[PDB]
Each structure stands twice: as structure tokens, then as C-alpha cells.
Amino acid sequence: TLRRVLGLTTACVPEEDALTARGLMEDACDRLILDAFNKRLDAEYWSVRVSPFEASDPLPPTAFRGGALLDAEHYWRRVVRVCPGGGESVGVPVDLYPRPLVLPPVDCAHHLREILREIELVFTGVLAGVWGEGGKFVYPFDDKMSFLFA
């Protein structure tokens, strides 16, 4: 997206260029979210890494029944997030259970919001630096594509 946006710059066009750039950023976000739907069932794809120096969800008791799988936990812990019922969104340590996993639907909305925050963090800076804007780049996740993972 940054390659395309900064390639459009050589067209020597006024503020209309910034509107075009905003359109491309929104299109890119839309396509990313749409392509993230086909991997809604993958638990390893959405799991995030946690170091011992960060706060994390408490370990479920069943994680203590893994056995020999608990030996390979030197530093990192991979945690995914699932929805057991109505708006609960509990955390699951992925690597502590034998394969295959039988889990409720993955909480893709939470992880996608976490990713979109970082996406907007760079898009807003690019917009404010290249064209000297003052408007923060916000993607309406809740009102556009939040129904897919509901």
C-alpha cells in the first residue's frame, strides 16, 4: 500500500491526491480483512507470542494435564483467544494441548483490531508526513466488516 501511495505522488496533483491515497488505504484494509476470513479456523495463525515480562491471561487448569508438552516452555508462550459463549473471549495456550485442537470459534475480531491499530499507526503518519494532513486515519471496522466474525 505504501509503494502504491508514494508512487501516485509523482503525478503532481493537489490535495485530491491525498483523497486518492486515503481511498487506497481503505481499499487495502478492506482486502486484508476479507482475506483474513478464509483463515478464521486456524488457531496457530492468530496466536500471539508473550514473554515472561508481560501480563497475560491465567493458565486454565487443563493446561496442567499436557504432560511432556510442558517441557518446551523456556521463554515464550503462544496464546490464542476464543469465544466460548456470549461475549466471554477467553485465552487459550495453544502449544500445551495435543493435536488436533477442538476449540470454539476464534476471536478474530479482537486480533484484527489489534493489527488494525498498528496499520493505522503507520498509515496516519505517512499521510501526515507526505501531504501535511491533520486527520487521523481510522478504519470503521465495527460498522463495515464486524458481522463476518459475529
Binding site: 460498522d143 463495515k144 466488516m145 458481522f147
Partner: protein, 53 residues
């Protein structure tokens, strides 16, 4: 009542003015009510659809 008040007994020189009663009521309230009881206007005014392709 201010619109229909006079200040001169002579009918030719009376200071009566047209009453702004029917116009305001029909422009502020009854137009929306008329638009409410038509299906096309009701759909156009009362629902805001959102679609994803």
C-alpha cells in the same frame, strides 16, 4: 392573532396581514406525515441499509 389585528377603522386603510398559521403547520408537520403513509417515501426515509459485497 397578531396577524389579524387592525389599527384603522377604514377597510381600505386596514393594517391586517395574511395569517402565518396554515403554512407553518403544513410545512413543519403535515409534510412528514404525508411522506410517512407512502411506501416509497417510507422506505426512503425510515431505513438506512448497509450491504457488504
Amino acid at each position: 392573532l397578531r396577524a389579524v389585528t387592525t389599527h384603522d377603522p377604514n377597510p381600505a386603510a386596514s393594517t391586517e396581514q395574511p395569517s402565518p398559521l396554515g403554512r407553518e403547520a403544513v410545512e413543519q408537520f403535515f409534510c412528514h406525515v404525508r411522506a410517512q403513509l407512502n411506501i416509497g417515501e417510507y422506505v426512503k426515509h425510515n431505513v438506512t441499509p448497509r450491504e457488504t459485497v
